[PDB]
Nucleic acid binder design. Structure first.
Lengths: 150, 142, 129
RNA sequence: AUAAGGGAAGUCGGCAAAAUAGAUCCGUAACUUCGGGAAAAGGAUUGGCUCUAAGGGUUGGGCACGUUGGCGGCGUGCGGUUAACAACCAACUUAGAACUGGUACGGACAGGGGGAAUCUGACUGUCUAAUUAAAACAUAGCAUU
RNA sequence: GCGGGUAAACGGCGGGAGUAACUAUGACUCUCUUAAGGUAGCCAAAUGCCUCGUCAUCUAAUUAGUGACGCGCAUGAAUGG
RNA sequence: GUAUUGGCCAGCCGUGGUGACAACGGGUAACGGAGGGUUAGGGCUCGACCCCGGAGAAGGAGCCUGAGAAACGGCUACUACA
RNA sequence: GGUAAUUCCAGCUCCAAUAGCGUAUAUUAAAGUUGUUGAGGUUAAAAAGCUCGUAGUUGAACCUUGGGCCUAGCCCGCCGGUACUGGCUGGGCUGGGCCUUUCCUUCUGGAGAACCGCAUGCCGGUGUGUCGGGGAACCAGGACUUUUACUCUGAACAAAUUAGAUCGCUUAAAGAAGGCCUAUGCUUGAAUACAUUAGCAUGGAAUAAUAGAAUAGGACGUGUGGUUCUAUUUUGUUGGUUUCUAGGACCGCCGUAAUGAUUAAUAGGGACAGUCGGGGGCGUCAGUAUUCAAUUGUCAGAGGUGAAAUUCUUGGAUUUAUUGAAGACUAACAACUGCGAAAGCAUUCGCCAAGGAUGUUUUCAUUAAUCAGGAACGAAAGUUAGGGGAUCGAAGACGAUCAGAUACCGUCGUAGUCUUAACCAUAAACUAUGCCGAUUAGGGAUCGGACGGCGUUUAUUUUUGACCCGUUCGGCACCUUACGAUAAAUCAAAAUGUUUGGGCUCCUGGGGGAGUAUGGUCGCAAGGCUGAAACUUAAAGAAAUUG
RNA sequence: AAAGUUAUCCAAACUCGGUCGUUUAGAGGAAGUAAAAGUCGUAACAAGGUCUCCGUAGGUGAACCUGCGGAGGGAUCAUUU
């Protein structure tokens, strides 16, 4: 029911039964791409760009109007990041707790909690390599993990 | 309940059976071969021995009697055991130094009835057999 | 997690028959279940079944006509010879004169008493009577 | 200083003497305060002569299309990285092979005998100059006023 | 002088009668005596007279050596075990 | 070198080979198989022994004759018996 | 069996098998007490203290179905006739051909039928003939095709043994013989099936895996340059040379095309938004109470028990008031209420990192479940060095009770109880109930989030807060009932199990000996982990009923 | 062309050490099981007369006591502003 917990949740998002853009939008696909690229240039990430595009003006679901996904669009325009978002975000958590442990040496629970993050990181990295997204020698040395972040 | 059931999982089923097989008592005594090493009889059915003395054995609680046992030393190994004469008034047919033949009680190691701790019984004496003397169909050699 | 949708569907059907209802829902759709339902339907053990549709796995709804008993499934896909079928029909069937074991062959998902006629064999999936 | 055969049978007691001994290569137990025991125990080689191999330094390349200077030095601008070359200079240490001898070769000097246990002091150290160097004294550790 | 404290202060740490289904001994009991009556450990030991104690091992032969036994003339806990 | 291939052997040169899918080692009152005993189906257990294959002639090694032997109702030496 | 023996020793009578019966040891069925089919794990023997994770096992849905014609072989129903014969436009089952976007690779050679035109001939046709033109069945030869698992059919594979056909050795176990008339003779059998794993061919294409075009390094062309190599037989013969020509490798321009990417799982991960919690760490704030100390005031016994007694007192006990110090702990609110993987966690504020549920027309796209060895945390007691040492309090000393009392009752009191830096890794670590997933019955309470609604309440008010009614998601629990389960007690799981198979890990096999001995390994030690045998025994044990 | 003889090779057999495996002798020590009539107490089963049991630590002729932290398999499913 959940990877690393004892509880189950079903707070998902239901996708409508309509593969046609609402008529009132009346927006062409050609103009859609530039604003997406605009936010990526200012420094945003594919996940968060969608919520502004959805909230601020018009398109609820990019796929129907465009025919392709945000990452697919970005990859063909050479703005795709080197390391996939899911792997990147996890690392950001692991580094911060490490800094906490060196000052607070008696925080036993976080030591247990820390075990979870890289175990998730290791499990996710294995899949990326066997499909061909990551080079087959990437290893995530716990020492230099900071360099990977930036 | 709790077995492995997959199609490519014959190895686990074989391993568990061979391991859990040892908790059985009947099978385990055969594999280790304790009877051959330990039992006074080296896996055989009968044996011959020489008589040392005659002893009386007291019965257990509900009964009360003297069970009239005998002391024997085997020729194969030279160990000494106790044997139950199994008839009525036969202690007048066995004397000292008479080279008797022994069998078991048919309980496969444990003691039968009330006699506290004897696992064998005399079948022959001077090669004549007990029942022959009892029904006076023969005579002992002189 | 879900590992045998065919077993899940059959289990739901059995509950209704022993409780006496006339309707069951089936959440995951697949060719194997839908063809499995047809083999009973050609013998009358079930009634009319409706397939809904959405861009997803897809639900199914059939209404139970009664006159149906235990219908199970064998989870480990065994290998059956054409000679070792009398063993299986002796194994799990109330009687010889009726009941059906269902196989999968290269000629399609089908049952015995015709596999004997067509001289075919394959793997076992279930049974119903 | 040396002695045939025996090898502690001598004597309170192996007292005195003999035996092992350098270097290179193998192998090394119980026990333990895991640092030791350990050169444990126990084995093999060692000359002469003729050869072979390995372990370095210094100086040039280094080009072209001009330049100031008495063939050459600097101040240029470029390129180019010899599957690395050529000349000269200098001691020793290590390894391998053949031949050879009355089978000998750390040829003199120099140069540990070893093992299984018991009593007693933890260890390095100190004292009766001129009969006793020890189990005696001292020591770090512990405790008391 | 009378009354309390103090043993890693000096030192000390016993005798006598009955008894369990052969016997034998005495867990247990009764009794005298003072401040308490040798606990954990160890042994013919550099500490044991009787003594060349008794048993095993080492030798052809051992008052010597080692391992056990313990009513120990007269072992024993910082006079440290 | 053998009747012939082969790390079978002699020289020079590389650093490899097997393993939790159980290597290496230890036990077997263990010659292997065709097969015997008992049964709903699935099995459990035995197999020195009349047929096929392997090894041995007290224990080890060495050899002559011949197409074929490391032979033993053939020889040589040691061990243990006699 | 203890003086009338249903059981000993004897006579009579009777029972079972019978030329055989008894006894001992080994093995099989009985044994669903080894359990893949097919066995237990709340209390009877047994779910590791809890979580992470590698070998190993198992893994959501989705890509050619349907319809329209023709034909064959076989069974049943029907009619009728003589076991035999024909018929139904009979009903079916198996198979083979075409059409619907689907048909089914290709080259060379062989012989040759049906359909076609000729005439010698007969009754709209045929042998005619070295007459000739098509596309197709077979054979031979060559080239091309995702790979394993699975199933069908073939080949090959001792004799004896197993099942099994035939023959009156006088029958049978056996044997492979024999049979007919009259015969100088004739005639037969010595069959058949299986083994089943591995290897060799063939048909099938569901089921379970695996690869293909995404920075196009993609497919095709008798379009068209190019640069490289190989070289038949023909020009009398040989050698060398060349043009054309045949083939192969690499690489450009142009043309052809619907030019190449599955859903977004009541699978999983991550991002985002407002909340939520006695989850954790570091610092910091506050609170009485206990003990001691100082100041202050008086006058006799005070403490303690079922009742006594130790101990303390005019150097004033006990009691009263103000002030100070030390250490531990956060009462009442506090509950069938919360959080955490468990052990556990309750005073304020500040800092630091973390988490579930909810909301969501954001994002990736199978990335998942459980885990032998392996690893992190792990109450209390205990160990090694410091600090601190208020209160309680192992060991111990005294006072009582008691025949004794090394205890239960009382006064003190050392280690310890607290903390810092390191060890130990066991508990009735209990829900005596492993983890993931699906279905199954009614109800009212309760915690967190969201949604809808008439009202009330008091707010620089109105939105909101708070109270009421209802719906929904996720938790800690409870009440009635059994359609179900169990031996029962009881259970919404301990159900969906003789009508037995969703996936994965661990543990037990009558009671003792025994969590002992020996070996290995971790630890300063106490000890932890792994873990037998000899021997002994007919009962130990669970739930419920009557006394 | 025999005896003999020089240098390699295959090698039985013997001596000494090391390691592994099997059988077995022993002064003495510490146990467990059975046969019970003995002897000393009464720990457990009732609120067994101090509720029982678990982990740990110390002590005591013996069953056993006490301290700290747990459990009910208890002698309580339950007490109101």
């Amino acid at each position: 029911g959940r990877l690393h917990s004892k509880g189950k949740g079903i707070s998902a998002s239901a996708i409508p039964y309509s593969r046609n853009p609402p008529a009132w939008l009346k927006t062409t696909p050609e103009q859609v791409v530039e604003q997406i690229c605009k936010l990526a240039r200012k420094g945003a990430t594919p996940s968060q760009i969608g919520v502004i595009l959805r909230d601020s003006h018009g398109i609820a679901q990019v796929k129907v109007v465009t025919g392709n996904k945000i990452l697919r669009i970005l990859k063909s325009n050479g703005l795709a990041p080197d390391i996939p978002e899911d792997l990147y975000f996890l690392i950001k958590k692991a580094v911060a707790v490490r800094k906490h442990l060196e000052r607070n040496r008696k925080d036993k629970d976080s030591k247990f909690r820390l075990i979870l993050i890289e175990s998730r990181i290791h499990r996710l990295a294995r899949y990326y390599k066997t499909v061909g997204v990551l080079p087959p020698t990437w290893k995530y040395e716990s020492s230099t993990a900071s360099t990977l972040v930036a | 309940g709790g077995k492995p059931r997959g199609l490519n999982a014959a190895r686990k089923l074989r391993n568990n059976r061979r391991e859990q097989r040892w908790a059985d008592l009947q099978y385990k005594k055969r594999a280790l071969g304790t009877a051959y090493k330990s039992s006074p009889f080296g896996g055989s059915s009968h044996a011959k021995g020489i008589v040392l003395e005659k002893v009386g054995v007291e019965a257990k609680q509900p009964n009360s009697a003297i069970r009239k046992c005998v002391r024997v030393q085997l020729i194969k190994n030279g160990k000494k055991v106790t044997a139950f004469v199994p008839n009525d008034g036969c202690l007048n047919f066995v004397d000292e130094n008479d080279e008797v033949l022994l069998a078991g009680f048919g309980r496969k190691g444990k003691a039968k009835g009330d006699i506290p701790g004897v696992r064998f019984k005399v079948v022959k004496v001077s090669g004549v057999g007990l029942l022959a003397l009892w029904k006076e169909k023969k005579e002992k050699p002189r | 997690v879900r590992t045998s949708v065919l077993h899940d569907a059959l289990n739901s059907i059995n509950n209704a028959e022993k409780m006496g209802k006339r309707q069951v829902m089936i959440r995951p759709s697949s060719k194997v279940i839908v063809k499995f339902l047809q083999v009973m339907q050609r013998h009358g053990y079930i009634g009319e079944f409706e397939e809904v549709d959405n861009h997803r796995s897809g639900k199914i709804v059939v209404q139970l006509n009664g006159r149906l008993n235990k219908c199970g499934v064998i989870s480990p896909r065994y290998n059956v010879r054409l000679a070792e079928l009398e063993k299986w029909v002796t194994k799990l069937l109330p009687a010889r004169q009726f009941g059906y074991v269902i196989l999968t062959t290269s000629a399609g998902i089908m049952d015995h008493e015709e596999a004997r006629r067509k001289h075919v064999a394959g793997k076992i999936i279930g049974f119903f009577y």
